[PDB]
Amino acid sequence: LLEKLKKLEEDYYKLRELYRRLEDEKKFIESERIRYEREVRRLRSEVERLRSPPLLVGVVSDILEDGRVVVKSSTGPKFVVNTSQYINEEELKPGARV
Amino acid sequence: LLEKLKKLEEDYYKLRELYRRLEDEKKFIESERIRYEREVRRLRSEVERLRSPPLLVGVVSDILEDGRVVVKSSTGPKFVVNTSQYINEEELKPGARV
């Protein structure tokens, strides 16, 4: 009928507007993704500066559960340095090269 | 009447759909956004802690009544160092590794 066609016209109209705002929102989201993509390549490069030399072999002295590792360096001195998600401390042991 | 409402109902019904198609294409870009957000946070946090100065290990060989503590360094030589307030020199005695 006449009533039924008025129910659907308004329904599409409201849904139309909803998606319309959302299409701009997600265009803007894209701009945000370029900003974060760049940050990932930068922050990874800092990691790759670590993977580059100057590098120094130290051999693990003991492992602490406070979230630190005592490493006896081959230079001489032992030092306490924090853990990372670029290692496992399971794999670390007294006498583990690192 | 029925025909009049129908023409308008078609144009909106068409525009509805068109926005919903672009919304799908962009939905992957947003998924990438959220993904890269995590990769941004993770990388920066771990590189910061590792970049932070490494902390040398010492062993208290002696202690002064002047409120300084004489710490034999893991390099080899001995130094006279100042106590904090995190750690007080009555939380320490000779042989406490610090």
Runs of H (alpha helix) within chain A: 2-50
- The whole-angstrom separation of Cα A67 and Cα A92 is 13
The residues facing A55 across adjacent strands are none
Please indicate the experimental technique that yielded this structure.
cryo-EM
Specify burial of residue B90 (Cβ count, 10 A radius: 0-12, 13-18, 19+).
exposed
Contacts of A8 (CB under 8 A, 6+ apart): B9, B13
The answer to whether B57 contacts A79, with C-beta atoms less than 8 Å apart, is yes
Q: Peptide bond before B53: cis, by omega within 30 degrees of 0?
A: no
- The whole-angstrom separation of Cα A85 and Cα B42 is 9
- The whole-angstrom separation of Cα B19 and Cα A15 is 10
Closest CB to A36: pick one of B19, B37, B56. B37
- The whole-angstrom separation of Cα B21 and Cα B23 is 5
Probe site for chain A from B2, B5, B17, B43 (most A CB atoms < 10 A): B43
**B46: nearest Cα among A56, A36, A50:** A50
Contacts of A60 (CB under 8 A, 6+ apart): A69, A70, A71, A72, A92, A93, A94, A95, A96, A97, A98
Helix (H, G, I), strand (E, B) or coil at A41: helix
Tell whether A17 lies on the interface with B, counting CB pairs under 8 A: no
